[PDB]
Design a protein around this nucleic acid. Structure first.
Lengths: 118, 167, 239, 53, 155, 61, 226
RNA sequence: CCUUCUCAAACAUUCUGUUUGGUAGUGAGUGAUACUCUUUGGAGUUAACUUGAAAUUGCCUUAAA
């Protein structure tokens, strides 16, 4: 059996979650959509996961878009067996729009003593 | 010692080894006399083989005494002594010295799109390239080597001789 | 003046210690700083004046070494109009325009291969600002793969003499360096073969003086790739 | 027989560029667009010189 | 009943991949008679008063297209389904598969020829291209050559 | 009546091309068959029976 | 149903438009503060200032089907130029100057002429008022004499003078004019219209170009084209 | 199926030298020792290298009909 989760790697650049939800909503009532975004930067990894409320539609969508040649690169859409849910995919964001002399002297002395190790 | 070198990067390895000196007498032995004629034009050491004029060959060798030679012509005429193409005899070379092979004694060592563009653009360097490639192929097939026979695919041999499509 | 005694000691101690390719040969100087450019990451390549034309030995070693680098000059549409090189002791390798880089290199593999070919990345100041959107991360992920800025325009028009004199000066004076938003900065120098001790001390003196003048540097250490951090100057008085 | 006007001008340009160095003319992609061999080059250049000294 | 060797056509490339292939081929349309004539006239006028990179164009003629095939010079082969003499194209997919060259089938010989000026072209091929050719070849493979590799079966 | 075919031959791929025809110079030369037409047009222009393209635009009265 | 390519293209275009708008707004905010210390430029220029000048603006179609963005959509709603091929006269000012860049990609601006303004006013005009859905044209000056004329704008010639001379009643008349819906260029389809549209589209790229630079000079073209 | 910020200012003017500003990037993944800060939370920085736009889970409609 195939689970409702759909694995699609090789996603086009800029193919955010909103576009995936909008396009897959045509096929029916999709459950959830998530994308693997890097913590350091919001740029995605070009691979994400999404789930459908119906397992039949889940594989129907993969069959229809199995090797569809979208702009940039084709979609590597695959369907996993029962289980393998969409657990844990966070929507990382960049950010909101926008005494000492003693330690330094000690470190300098330590470096001056250590340089003799050469 | 012998050096393991894949045919896909044989040209790159040879170019690096040549660039490692730029002057010292890096003696190299080639199985095919036609191949050296094609390799001489790839420097864009001097040509020294038996197929060319004997007088000019001798004069060039005398000048160099102050290379690019085949197995047969190197015998008796004489930093690194190397053999790239398969030897004319498996043991005549063993009798500094280093070897290159990858179909299968002392030790072993450890560790270019312009040519591809030009091969299809220059007619003469294309005819010479294919001539050398298939002369090396004939030498490899005609040689009764102990453990080397017709098995290796030419898909990498063509690349080794700068050729893209299989001739 | 910077302490020349420490430099004289280092030019012998470090040479003995080092005497793998970049670790043994690649000379560099590291300058400690107290933050930079606030909350911004402008990719401006700062230039430092060098008393010696270290580019000539750099290309001499590269010519005699396996790694042969190429100089790429990014130009504009008007610049297409061998005159761009006939007036240059120094020879430019390749000249390309931004028109091609934005489309003919859509394949990231080809873009990476093209970038790795060159090391002295030169570009017109007018088009330098638009480069990062084209060459991608890999070019800006290494100091030697990012575009350097050279002034070629004169009276808002192309000038062959302006390009020639500026490129000659850069080849016999300027040295690039990045501007990270951090407390550490690196300025590559050259190879172990570069000049002799006293000449090397003179070479480092101007670099250190310019670094001190340009900004309130914190400390500078004489260094070599993965070598011990030999102290040079202690500029804690600013703190 | 003689060389054509355009052919004569091309041969004169090649001779000025290289003189009698047919080997250099062979690799002269700027003028040797057809990749003339070392023999044809000299065969045409001798006839060109016959009328030019 | 059609034999297994026949009916390999009619089952052809999908809509999106076919459109992408047509768009890619349109980028290398051969110079037409009028354009070639005007270019030659301009060249003559320039030379008559006061040396170019090798051109690129799609291959369409059956004889020379097959000549490029077998020599491994054909990077991609596109074949029409509605060709009247089927025997002209029955062996072409087999030859392409034997030589290890990507191949594809399309519906409508006239649409095949519309991208090469001629009224009809039966088959078409490409010799040189920029980088989308590899992606198109992979898509064609995964959608026709590997998904329908069982063409030898059925009747 | 209804049996599948056998791909006994369409399972291995040839390496070397079936023929070793020598490479003709024309493939490496700029279309001498086209230089012929260029020179024919040059001759026609010299004879004056063919109008230069510029005069075509200059005479669109 | 809609194919995937359209959604991806719309998203890519929207991202670029939003980035350009944000960059332009951020640069203009710093320019207004007069700091002008770490920005590309502080001055303004036009090539082919914020001084007063009456200009004509035409709403052009394109770029690609970008979802209505808040800033540009609101700016257009202020001028009520949502419909394509619609134009209206606006008084150029330093405060209004950044609006050009804000809505530059969607509109084309230039300096009109007295003859062009007179012809446009006398050939087209709307008065959407007394149910009051009627699009009555400026048939007679009686409406101008009654509803207008409080400030002395009694006839169409007075409106022309106010528009060209930037009179006090310029705001009142401009709102009353219900800016004109200019006819589209080709205005057809079929055998000849397809080729005519294709031929005309080439000039659009060479005329309606956006450099997307934050300090890009104001795009200006002669209104004599139409 | 879509094209990326291809110069803004001052001295001086020698067919233009000097000075400043303007460059927020595809990710995946390896990695040779140091900088501080920041007050236990880890935050940014210093060489070099692989990549098929490869990849499995970090809390306004005449681009219409």
């Amino acid at each position: 059996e195939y689970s409702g989760i759909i694995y699609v790697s090789r996603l086009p650049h800029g193919f955010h979650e909103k576009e995936l939800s909008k396009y897959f909503a045509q096929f029916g009532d999709l459950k959830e959509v998530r994308l693997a975004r890097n913590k350091k930067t919001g740029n995605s990894r070009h691979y994400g996961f999404l789930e459908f409320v119906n397992k039949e539609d889940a594989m129907i969508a993969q069959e229809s878009m199995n090797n569809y040649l979208l702009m940039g690169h084709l979609l590597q859409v695959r369907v996993l067996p029962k289980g393998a849910k969409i657990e844990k995919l966070y929507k990382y964001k960049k950010r909101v729009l926008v005494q000492l002399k003693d330690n330094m002297k000690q470190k300098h002395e330590e470096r001056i003593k250590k340089l003799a190790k050469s | 010692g012998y050096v393991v070198c894949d045919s896909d990067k044989r040209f790159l390895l040879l170019f690096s080894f040549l660039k490692r000196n730029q002057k010292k007498k890096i003696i190299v032995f080639l199985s095919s006399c036609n191949s050296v004629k094609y390799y001489a034009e790839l420097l864009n050491v001097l040509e020294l083989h038996g197929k060319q004029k004997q007088q000019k060959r001798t004069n060039t060798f005398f000048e160099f005494c102050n290379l690019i030679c085949t197995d047969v012509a190197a015998r008796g005429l004489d930093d690194w002594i190397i053999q790239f193409d398969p030897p004319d005899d498996p043991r005549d070379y063993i009798h500094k010295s280093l070897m290159f092979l990858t179909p299968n004694p002392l030790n072993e060592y450890e560790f270019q799109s312009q040519l591809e563009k030009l091969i299809k653009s220059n007619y003469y360097l294309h005819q010479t390239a294919k001539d050398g490639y298939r002369s090396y192929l004939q030498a490899y097939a005609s040689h009764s080597l102990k453990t080397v026979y017709q098995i290796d695919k030419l898909d990498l041999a063509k690349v080794a001789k700068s050729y893209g499509f299989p001739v | 003046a910077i302490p020349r005694e420490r430099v004289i000691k280092a030019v012998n101690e470090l040479i003995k210690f080092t005497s793998e390719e970049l670790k043994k040969d690649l000379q560099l100087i590291v300058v400690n700083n107290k933050s930079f450019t606030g909350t911004s990451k402008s990719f401006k390549l700062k230039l430092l004046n060098v008393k010696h034309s270290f580019y000539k030995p750099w290309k001499e070693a590269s010519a005699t070494a396996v790694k042969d680098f190429k100089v790429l000059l990014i130009l504009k549409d008007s610049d297409i109009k061998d005159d761009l090189f006939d007036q240059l002791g120094i020879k430019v390798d390749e000249i390309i325009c931004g028109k091609d880089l934005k489309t003919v290199y859509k394949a990231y593999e080809a873009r990476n291969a093209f970038i790795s070919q060159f090391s002295l990345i030169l570009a017109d100041d007018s088009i330098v600002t638009s480069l990062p959107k084209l060459m991608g991360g890999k070019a800006y992920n290494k100091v030697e793969t990012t575009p350097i800025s050279i002034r070629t325009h004169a009276n808002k028009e192309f000038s062959l003499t302006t390009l020639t004199n500026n490129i000659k000066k850069v080849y016999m004076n300027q040295l690039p360096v990045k501007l990270p938003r951090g407390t550490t900065l690196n300025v590559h120098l050259g190879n172990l073969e570069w000049l002799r001790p006293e000449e090397f001390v003179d070479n480092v003196e101007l670099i250190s003086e310019q670094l001190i003048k340009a900004y309130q540097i914190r400390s500078i250490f004489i260094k070599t790739n993965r070598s011990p951090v030999l102290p040079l100057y202690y500029n804690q008085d600013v703190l | 027989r003689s060389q054509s006007e355009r052919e004569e001008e091309w041969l004169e340009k090649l001779y000025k560029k290289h003189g009698d160095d047919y080997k250099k003319m062979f690799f002269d992609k700027k003028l040797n667009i057809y990749q003339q061999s070392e023999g044809d080059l000299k065969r045409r250049l001798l006839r060109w010189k016959k009328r030019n000294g | 009943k059609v034999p297994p060797t026949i009916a390999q056509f009619q089952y052809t490339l999908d809509r999106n991949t076919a459109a992408e292939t047509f768009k890619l081929f349109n980028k290398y349309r051969p110079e037409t008679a009028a354009e070639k004539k005007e270019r030659l006239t301009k060249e003559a006028a320039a030379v008559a008063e006061g040396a170019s990179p090798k051109p690129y164009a799609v291959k369409y003629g059956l004889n020379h297209v097959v000549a490029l095939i077998e020599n491994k010079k054909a990077k991609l082969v596109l074949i029409a389904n509605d060709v009247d003499p089927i025997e002209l194209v029955v062996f072409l997919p087999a030859l392409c598969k034997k030589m290890g060259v990507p191949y594809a089938i399309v519906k409508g010989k006239a649409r095949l020829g519309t991208l090469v000026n001629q009224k009809t072209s039966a088959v078409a091929a490409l010799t040189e291209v920029e980088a989308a050719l590899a992606k198109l070849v992979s898509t064609i493979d995964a959608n026709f050559a590997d998904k329908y590799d069982e063409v030898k079966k059925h009747w | 009546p209804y049996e599948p075919l056998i791909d006994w031959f369409t399972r291995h791929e040839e390496v070397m091309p079936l023929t070793a025809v020598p490479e003709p110079k024309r493939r490496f030369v700029p279309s001498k068959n086209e230089a012929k037409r260029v020179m024919k047009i040059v001759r026609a222009i010299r004879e004056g029976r063919i109008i230069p393209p510029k005069k075509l635009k200059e005479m669109k009265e | 149903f809609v194919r995937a390519e359209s959604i991806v293209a719309k998203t890519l275009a929207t991202s670029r438009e939003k980035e350009r708008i944000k960059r332009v707004s951020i640069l203009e905010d710093k320019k207004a503060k007069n700091e002008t210390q770490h920005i590309a430029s502080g001055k303004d220029f036009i090539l082919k200032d914020g001084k007063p000048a009456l200009l004509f603006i035409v709403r052009v179609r394109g770029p690609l089907a970008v979802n209505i963005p808040n800033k540009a959509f609101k700016i257009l709603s202020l001028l009520r130029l949502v419909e394509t091929n619609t134009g209206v006269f606006v008084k150029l000012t330093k405060n209004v100057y950044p609006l050009l860049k804000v809505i530059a990609p969607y509109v084309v601006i230039g300096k009109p002429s007295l003859s062009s303004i007179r012809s446009l006013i006398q050939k087209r005009g709307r008065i959407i008022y007394k149910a009051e859905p009627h699009e009555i044209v400026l048939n007679d000056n009686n409406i101008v004499e009654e509803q207008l004329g409080d400030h002395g704008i009694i006839c169409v010639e007075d409106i022309i003078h106010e528009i060209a001379t930037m009179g006090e009643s310029f705001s009142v008349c401009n709102f009353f004019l219900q800016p004109f819906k200019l006819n589209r260029e080709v205005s057809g389809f079929g055998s000849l219209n397809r080729l005519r549209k294709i031929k005309q589209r080439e000039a659009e790229s060479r005329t309606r170009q956006f450099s997307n630079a934050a300090t890009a000079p104001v795009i200006e073209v002669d209104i004599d084209s139409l």
